[model samples]
Target: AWPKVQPEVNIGVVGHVDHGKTTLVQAITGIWTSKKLGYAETNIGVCESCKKPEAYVTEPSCKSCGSDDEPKFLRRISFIDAPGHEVLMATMLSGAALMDGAILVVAANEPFPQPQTREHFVALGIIGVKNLIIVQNKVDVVSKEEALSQYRQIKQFTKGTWAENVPIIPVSALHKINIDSLIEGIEEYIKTPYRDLSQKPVMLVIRSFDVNKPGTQFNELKGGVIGGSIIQGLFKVDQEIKVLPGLRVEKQGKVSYEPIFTKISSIRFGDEEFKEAKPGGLVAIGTYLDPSLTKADNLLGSIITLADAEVPVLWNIRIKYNLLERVVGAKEMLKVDPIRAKETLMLSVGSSTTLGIVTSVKKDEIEVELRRPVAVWSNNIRTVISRQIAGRWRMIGWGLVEI
Candidate 1:
C-alpha cells in the first residue's frame, strides 16, 4: 500500500512591477533583486549587472547570483520572483507557470486594486494557485488613515478570489518595518515536512543557467544546471535520470576532446551537502548531457517509465467578466508549457501541472481535455488562457464550478 503522508507545500512570489515584489523577497529571504543593485548610476539604468530589460529610473540592477558562495540570503524560503513590468508581460505566463503558491505584493501607497495588481491576483486565481498571501507593502509611504483605506480597497479586490480569507499583512520592505509579518505570513502559508524521496523524480525547473569558467575546452557543450525543489521522491547522486517530455539528457562529458554518457553527479539542496535529497527541498541537479531537453516548465518525474501516457487536456474553459457572469472559452493559444505550443495546454490541479486544450466553446462554457493523462475535474482544478484582442492578448479572468 502507498504510504499516506502530508503533502509538501511550495510557495510563489508575485505582484505588479515596482511594488517591491523582489524587495520583499530580499527582506524576507535576503535575496536582492535587480532593483536593489545600484542601477541608479547609469542614466539608462543599464549597469554591468543586468541581463536584460531597461533599468527603472529609481530601481537598481540585480546582483544576487554574482556572489561567490551563494548570497547571504536566508535559506528559509525558496522564491520564484515574477517580473511585474509590461514588457515582461509577454512572457509572464511562462515565468509564472512554475510556481506553486503565490505571494501577491502590493503597495499601500498605491490605490487599492491597481489594474496590474488586480490582473496578477486574477492570474494566480486562474492558474489555480489557491494558497496565497496578499501583502500590502510600502506602508511607510502613506499616512496611517490612507494606508488603512488602501488596505480596505485591497480587501475588497480579493473578496471573492482565492485569497479572500488569506491574511493581508501591511509592510514596508524599504524601511524594513513589518517585514517580520511578511516572513511570518509566508512561514504560515509556506513550509512543509519532508516526504518520501523514492517516488518518481518529478521536478519543475524554475531557474536554469550555464555554469562554466573561462578558457575551458569543454565549454561548448558543458551542458548546464537546473534548479528547483523536489516535488516528490528521493534522488541520490549518480542516478540515471531522464529529462522530461524530450527524454534527452542521457549523460556525456568530462573535460572535452573525449565524451562519455554519464548520469547525474550531484544533487544539492539549497546550501546543505547531501548524499541523497528528497521532496520539499531546493535541488540543484548537475548533468553531463546537454540541457536542451530540460526546458523551463518541463515536468520531471520518472512515472513515464512505468506506463506514462499522453492524456488530452479536457476542461470547460470559462471566462467570467464579473463575480457573477457568463463563462466563455479560453480562445486562441498564447503560450503553453514553456514551449510555443498551440496544440494543447498545461492545467494546474492542486500542486501539479497537467496538459489540456480548448476543444469547443459556447456563450456560457467551453470544453477542454488533457493532451496527457491527468486526474482533474471541475472544482478539482482550473486554467488561465489569453484572449486575443485587437492584434494583442489579454488575460480574461478564471472560473471554478462542480462538474
Candidate 2:
C-alpha cells in the first residue's frame, strides 16, 4: 500500500466557505480519513499498464483493462482542510505552515475572488506555499458564458499574486466532472518538494489522541498517538524521543512545563503501519506514554525530537516583525495599526499557538513574553501574530524570531 509507502508530500485544500474543498479531494482520492472540519488524508498511485494520464490512479491496481500489474506506490498525498470561516484565519495560517502546496478552490457560479479567497491567497504567500492549483468549481451550476467570464476574472485576479502563472482547472467536485484533468493539473503544478533527512529528527505535534475507548481493560490499553507533518528528518519505531514543553504543572500560582521523554513503539501513515517513518506525509507516532497524557489533545503543539538532542525552549523571545499594509482577511480593508508595548497578541508558529505579551519595542524588533513556553531552533523561526479586533482575532502581522 502506498499508504504504507511513506507519503512524500502534503498538499493542502483551502478555499472560501463551502466551496467544494473537501468534495474535490474525495472525488480525486476516492478515500476519506476524516477529522474535524473535513480533514482527510488520501493516497496516489501509478501503474505502467494504464499508460500516461490514466496510469496515475489511486487503486491498488490498474482499474482500466483489468491488468494484473499492480499499481506501483508513487506516494501519499494528504489534504488538510483549512477552516474557511473569517474568524478562524489564524488557524488557517497555522495549517498553512504544514502544506507543501495547495489547491485553492473558487466557485464558478459565485462572483470571482471572494473576500476570503484574497485573504487565503495572500496567506499562502506569507506561509511560504509558492505552488498551487486554482480550482474553478461548480461549472455545472453556471452557463458556458458565465464560466468564461469568471475565468477572465480569475485571470485578472492572479495577474498580481504570488501564483500568477499557476494552472486553473474547472470541475464540478460534486459530480466528479473533469477530475482527471484536475489530477493532472495537480501533478504538474505542485511538484514534490525536497526533503531534508540530514537534520535531527523532529515532529510538530498537531493532534494527539488516546485511542482507548471509555471502558477498556487495564492491560489492553494502547500508547499515546500524535499526528502532524514532519518538519525535517525521519522518525522510526523504538527510537527514544522527548516532547518539548510537554507537561504543565502549576505550583504556588506559578506555571512551568517539562518535556516528557518516551519511546516510539509504533509509527503509522493512515492505516499502514511502518517500522520507520519518512519525511513524506503527515504521520502519527505511537508512544509508550500513558493514554491519559494525550487524551483530549493535551500534548498538542508540542515538538518531539531525539531525546539526546538539544532544544532551546523559550519563555521570552525577541523578534524582528513586519506588518501588512492592510488586514487581509477582513471584509473591510482596514489599515493595520502598529504593534505597541503592553498589548497582548496570539502567536502561531509551526503547530504551536501561544499568547504573547509585548514586553519591549524598539523600531521593528519587539521582545515578547509567552504565556506558555515554546521551543525554537536558531535556524529559521517566524510567528503569525493576531490581534483582538472588534470581537475576533484578526491576523495583524508576522514576526521573524531573533535570538
- Assess every candidate by TM-score: 0.62, 0.93
> Taking the tens digit of each residue's C-alpha lDDT, what string does model 2 give over 1-403?
4444766777878888778787887887775535543455556666767656677776677857468777877666777777777877766777787788998999987876777787788778777887899899999898889988998888888887677788888899999888867766777887888887898887877788899987898889999888777778888889998998889987998889988999999998877898988665778899989988998878767888999989888999988888888877777768888889999988887788899899998878989999999878545778888888788787778878776
Off by over 4 Å in 2: 1-3, 32-34, 37-39, 46-55, 60-73
Which candidate gets the maximum TM-score versus the true structure?
2
- How far is 250's C-alpha from truth in model 2 (Å)? 1.3
What's the lDDT for residue 238 in model 1?
67
- Per-residue error (Å), model 1, residue 239: 1.8
Q: Candidate 2: lDDT of 293?
A: 92
Error of 1 at 291 (Å): 6.1
